Amino acid sequence: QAAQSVDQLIKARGKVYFGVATDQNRLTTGKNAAIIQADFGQVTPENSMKWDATEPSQGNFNFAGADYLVNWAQQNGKLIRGHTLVWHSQLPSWVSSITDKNTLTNVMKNHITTLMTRYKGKIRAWDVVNEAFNEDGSLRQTVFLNVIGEDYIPIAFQTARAADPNAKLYINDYNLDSASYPKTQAIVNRVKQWRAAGVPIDGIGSQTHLSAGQGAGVLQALPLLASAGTPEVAITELDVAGASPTDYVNVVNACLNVQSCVGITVWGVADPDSWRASTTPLLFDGNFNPKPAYNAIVQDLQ
Template sequence: MYSTSLLSLLAVPLTALAFPTTSLSTRQELESLHDKYVAAGKQYFGTIADEALLADEQNVGIIQQVFGQLTAENSMKWESIQPTLGGFNFAQPDVLVDFATANNMLIRGHTLIWHSQLPQYVSDITDAAELTEVIETHISEIMGRYVGKIFQWDVVNEIFNEDGSFRDSVFFNVLGEDFVRIAFEAAKAADPDAKLYINDFNLDSADNAKVQAMVTNVNKWVAEGVPIDGIGSQAHIAAGQGSAIPDAIKALAAADVAEVAITELDIADAPAEDYQQSVDACTQEPKCVGVTVWGVRDNDSWRPGTNPLLFDATGQPKEAYNTLVSNL
């Protein structure tokens, strides 16, 4: 079921949107980072959304002007999309997919297998055969619904500890590392044309043990025939860390995968230099296909009080946005 406000937004062209008087009512035109990045040879420059953000006119206006790809923020996570066994809830992800499709935007699916935001019924499974079936059904149902519409999926998310060991989770505890193969094979069967990613955070320095573990394990899995197409680096970083991102992206790109991406970029206090360094890291790496920033305006960020995004709480572009526009 779609909200009346969202349906009206989908039917109204950008030029007809009435933006709040504190922001884009000045009729300030924003330049598209997506168009500039595509012109630079990349596939996309994107952001996140879900139903609530797409019901906000200001947010929609910025998205339509600036970005060319949408990632589901929470609506495709397990507790949201299958809160009870066999009880799939597609209402919210349908809103995102329909909006992106109507606006000719690419879509990233996030995320299929993750230890967090997980219903208790999954965490309670102790039998390997049962968990395998639950994983395969979960992935088949979700990806099958959106086959041909979502071009990249984060199949497994945040599976390594900082020292490179496997994170404690129901998936690893019951199935060992074989859950990775199970998930990727199910994803490949559900949508053979989608690009399938392993995604993680703190992959922001080439020297990090997690980076080394990611590359080593991905190379092993690929050699064993696991259909991993890409590695996603979340890049939730602090000011001053942007300078390390280029070497980190190169280290990840050295793995036996077809592509890499920066998937969840946000930077505390949004320093323009760090944003530029992070985006440059992808620009300069041939395997890097795009950048996704984890939100539009600071007031919508999952990192409250850090002001990590390209637009402030009133929807005004910040220095980091202007710098990217100029340098791209």
């Protein structure tokens, strides 16, 4: 654990939190638990709340991993961001095998309702729909879109709101890092349209999985995302190939500069445990020691 907490410091700057992705496998090993307890104030389940883990077989839910994280979070006063309710990846074959509109709709609604109800009132925000956009801005042709149609998004959000009116509902996606990129402009326009039709989209989550030097563009991208009018926006899965302090500080400043940005979540704790470990993209090294990027963030927030 680092002496200076980025969560404490960002809270002092007026934001809600600075957190990290984690799960039982991390909390039970190394110094992950201690680091999170001391330097972060929010956690997102890296995998335990996804569809393949929670509903491997239809109507047969498994909350072992999810319960571990939620309980640990509550016991340690950490906020929680539910991830991911509707997504084409890490999706059971029984779901993708469905071709009937009514069937898939009910299946999707039940999945959403079951997970959110179990943790009702305990989750600050949920990534209801994940990666629904193609790079050109068109909607990704997933089983949900192909079988239910474009209305699957409004349906997912309306269902989520009814399940837990306390949680902030997000649509999450990547490559929303540049203001001139098609995808960024498209999600803004679509979210503007959906909210206008009454869809309860409370926030846009920008994964922010960057490569070296892409932090600079976020300074203009985040404000653009905020222009969609959602009450909230957030950096949800931050990591940067190379872990340059320049990229990290730029992303933090982008959030500080955007009134509606509630916080930042970095996608993991130590480099070797990153899903992109070959790019040592996190804030702590294999020795669980703070990297130059962590200190740079601290210095920027003070």
